[PDB]
């Protein structure tokens, strides 16, 4: 539920402290935590909103020049003077122009020419600062079990549903509890402050389009700019790079503006996150969080219910998720009240031997009516198998066939781990971090190597990186030392970072 | 450039490919891609739409 | 016939996609019409049979 079809989900099967299991949530996917005797919980981060940001250093990307003026000095005089020069709303440029006996000034030296033009801005972009406060993560929980078929994607009814919860986390209240009626309460302890390394990201708006932008890229953009919150008529600094004082045949100056500078900023913003904004709040579209899950107060609703003695039917038979798990929807005909559903995966129906794993929980049917509907998902074995539901001589059975082999599963697991590391750094070492001594040392050495690799490299983007990857591959192949091992490892790191895509 | 009335279509996990009737017009930009569907969107199957 | 997929995708003919609604549109416009050139700016269009 909430996770079935996502196609980017991973299971955090296992809990070796009897207690909390660390977990890192991303915008793309969702995490299904399954324990020994505790119901399978599905968690997903939904939206991260930022509100009441402060404003810093807005830039002007479309200039306009109001009125030109110019003055020439007849070479042996003082300097070309305009009273406008002292007004800081005007652009003034001084050059030398040929003069004499044609223009009425008797001498033939070079003279001074000053041209000034009024600078008036047009629509323009604002950067804003994301402080650690005022940042709110919304986390949705849901629970497997008696859920209907549709309830995986329904919109509202959270407070009424009793199996789904919504948790808001802010650095003012990092730790929260989700109260699931009848299942107990699941505790989330999260570190919001170190989520996506904010305090390096400005929120940038141009015209109803908003992005995240690195502080350095923003502070290194050449355009007219004035610091602080705007109002009224501003005082534009660096009133150039939008005004071009081109020269005529050594006798004039013409002042032109560079038009609208907006597509250049759009293509300059290559590799920055998008964002959408409604009202004052802006909801980011990508991030990640690290929440440990105190599952010490999760109970099991189903236990101490007698088995159901009726017949079951397949409404839509089975679906197969991308990851191989099978989702089944069963309809119950009898009326025994709340009772367990006996379900398993078997081969050799003569002797039903449990093969595979049933990843839902103790399946239950909550309602007590004529016909009820429930959904459960189970993890089949790689061979051909039968889905068995029911007890005796009425047990509905289905045939189900899964393609992969255990080696393929291990290979895909290592690939998923590699992608997660490439995306998250050491916080990937914090993914299922029940917490030992090997894991902590792994995280430590990964922190050190990551700091070094980010300081040396990490100023490249998919082509400088691929080129230096090939070059280090060669130089490591043919340098004849232990530096061969050094350079081949550097090549592996860089090229994997590239071809993750 | 300026843009106008967006539209979209999607046709399942195991059917053909989406086709808008506004693809037979030389004034519309159209892009075709894959989306995750199944058990929460309306079509029972779980591949890529 | 029963045809193996990857033979019903690597076939070079004008291909629609799925829903037949009104006046069809084929996204190929190639491999079934031969634009044979003449000489001295003469151009002719034929179909393959």
């Amino acid at each position, epitope marked *: 539920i909430r996770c079935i079809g996502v196609s980017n989900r991973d299971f955090v099967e296992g809990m070796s402290g009897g207690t909390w299991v660390d977990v890192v949530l991303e915008h793309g996917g969702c995490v299904t935590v399954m324990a020994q005797d505790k119901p399978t919980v599905d968690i997903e981060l939904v939206t991260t909103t930022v509100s009441n940001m402060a404003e810093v250093r807005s830039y002007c990307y479309e200039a306009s020049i109001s009125d030109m003026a110019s003055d020439s000095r007849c070479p042996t005089q003082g300097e070309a003077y305009l009273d406008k020069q002292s007004d800081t709303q005007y652009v003034c440029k001084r050059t030398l122009v040929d003069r004499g006996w044609g223009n009425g000034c008797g001498l033939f030296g070079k003279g001074s020419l000053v041209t000034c033009a009024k600078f008036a801005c047009s629509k323009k972009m604002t950067g804003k600062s994301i402080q650690p406060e005022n940042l709110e993560y919304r986390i949705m929980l849901s629970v497997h079990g008696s859920q209907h078929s*549709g309830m995986i994607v329904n*919109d509202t009814g959270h407070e009424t549903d009793e199996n789904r919860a919504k948790v808001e986390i802010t650095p003012n209240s990092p730790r929260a509890e989700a109260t699931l009626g009848g299942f107990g309460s699941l505790g989330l302890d999260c570190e919001p402050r170190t989520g996506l390394d904010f305090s390096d990201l400005y929120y940038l708006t141009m015209n109803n389009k908003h992005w995240l932008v690195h502080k350095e890229w923003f502070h290194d953009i050449p355009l007219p700019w004035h610091a602080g919150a705007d109002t009224g008529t501003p005082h534009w600094n660096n009133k150039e790079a939008l005004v071009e004082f081109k020269d005529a045949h050594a006798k004039r100056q013409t002042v032109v503006v560079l038009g609208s500078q907006e597509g250049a900023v759009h293509t300059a913003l290559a590799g920055a996150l998008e964002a959408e904004m409604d009202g004052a709040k802006g909801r980011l579209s990508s991030g990640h969080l690290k929440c440990r899950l105190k599952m010490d107060k999760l109970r099991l609703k189903g236990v101490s219910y007698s088995l159901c003695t009726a017949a079951f039917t397949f409404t839509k038979i089975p679906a197969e998720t991308l990851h191989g798990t099978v989702t089944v929807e069963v309809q119950y005909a009898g009326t025994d009240g709340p009772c367990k559903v006996p379900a398993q995966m078997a081969v050799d129906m003569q002797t039903l031997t449990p093969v595979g794993r049933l990843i839902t929980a103790n399946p239950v049917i909550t309602e007590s009516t004529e016909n009820s509907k429930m959904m459960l998902e189970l993890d089949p074995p790689f061979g051909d198998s039968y889905i068995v539901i029911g007890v005796g001589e009425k047990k509905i059975t289905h045939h189900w066939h899964r393609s992969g082999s255990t080696i393929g599963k291990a290979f895909e697991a290592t690939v998923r781990g590699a992608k997660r590391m490439a995306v998250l750094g050491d916080t990937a070492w914090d993914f299922g971090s029940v917490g030992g001594a090997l894991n902590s040392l792994g995280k430590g050495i990964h922190q050190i190597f990551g700091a070094a690799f980010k300081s040396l490299f990490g100023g490249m983007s998919w082509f400088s990186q691929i080129l230096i990857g090939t070059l280090l591959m060669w130089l490591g192949l043919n340098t004849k030392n232990g530096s061969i091992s050094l350079m081949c490892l550097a090549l592996g790191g860089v090229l994997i970072f590239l071809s993750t895509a | 450039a300026s843009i106008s009335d967006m539209a979209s*279509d999607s046709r399942c996990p195991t059917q053909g490919e989406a086709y808008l009737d506004k693809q037979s017009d030389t004034q519309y930009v159209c892009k075709r891609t894959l989306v995750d569907r199944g058990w929460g969107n309306g079509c029972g199957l779980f591949g890529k739409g | 016939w029963l045809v193996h997929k990857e033979w019903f995708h690597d076939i070079p003919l004008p291909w629609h996609a799925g829903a037949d609604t009104g006046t069809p549109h084929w996204n190929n416009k190639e491999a079934l019409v031969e634009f044979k050139d003449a000489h001295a700016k003469r151009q002719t269009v034929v179909v393959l049979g």
Partner: antibody, heavy 131, light 101 residues
């Protein structure tokens, strides 16, 4: 129960513009498809247009060659139908319709081909007179 | 266009589209409009009847037409009946309507 209320219908000259509105309450408006249908005086029902929850997909009948523009605001539970270059053939009662059958798909976004439907929740309709 | 009936009898209104994929009638919906009243739907998905609509109304469908059957006619039943379905994948179209007296 859900109640739909039309507004904005009135007399206008041929070639004029007119903006019809529909107010909804009592259900998850942000998740249901919405339809505009019309019925000429003494005539039958004629489907006009439909839109999704978010406003991404908009479908219009053949008789509207871009004259109509359907839109909505989920936060305000409001539906709008802009109309330009009115003629006499469009003088009729316009009914605002809720689409709950799609709400199979509780999102109301994905516009599958030939998806199941049936229109039971209608507004009272507003009269437009092009005279 | 119209059908006449006596109290207690059964009447069938047919809906036919010409050469439409031989699929369409699976999704035909039937709507009732009493004189001066807002239209009410009696049938959707071809044969499924909503809750609250009387069991008096029934529906059937084939590869060539759809039929709406009202048994035990009552004076209330006199109204205009309209069938609707897809013209193409993105469209909807209402039938010519039948006035049942």
């Amino acid at each position: 129960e859900v109640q739909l209320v039309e507004s904005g219908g009135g007399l206008v000259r041929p070639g004029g513009s007119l903006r019809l509105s529909c107010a909804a309450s009592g259900f998850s408006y942000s998740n249901h498809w919405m339809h505009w249908v019309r019925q000429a005086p003494g005539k039958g029902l004629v489907w006009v247009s439909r839109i999704n929850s978010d406003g991404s997909t908009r479908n219009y009948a053949d008789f509207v060659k871009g004259r109509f523009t359907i839109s909505r605001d989920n936060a305000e539970n409001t539906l709008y139908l802009e109309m330009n270059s009115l003629t006499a053939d469009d003088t009729a009662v316009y009914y605002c319709v809720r689409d709950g059958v799609r709400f199979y798909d509780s999102t109301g976004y994905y516009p599958d081909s030939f998806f199941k439907y049936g229109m039971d929740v209608w507004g009272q309709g507003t009269t437009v007179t092009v005279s | 266009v119209s059908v006449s009936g006596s109290p207690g009898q059964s009447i069938t209104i047919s809906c036919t589209g010409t050469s439409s994929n031989a699929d369409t009638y699976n999704l035909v919906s039937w709507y009732q409009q009493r004189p001066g009243k807002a239209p009410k739907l009696m049938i959707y998905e071809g044969t499924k009847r909503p809750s609250g609509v009387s069991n008096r109304f029934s529906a059937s469908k084939s590869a060539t037409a759809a039929s709406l059957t009202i048994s035990g006619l009552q004076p209330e039943d006199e109204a205009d009946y309209y069938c609707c379905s897809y013209a193409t994948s993105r469209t909807l179209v209402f039938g010519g309507g039948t006035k049942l007296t």
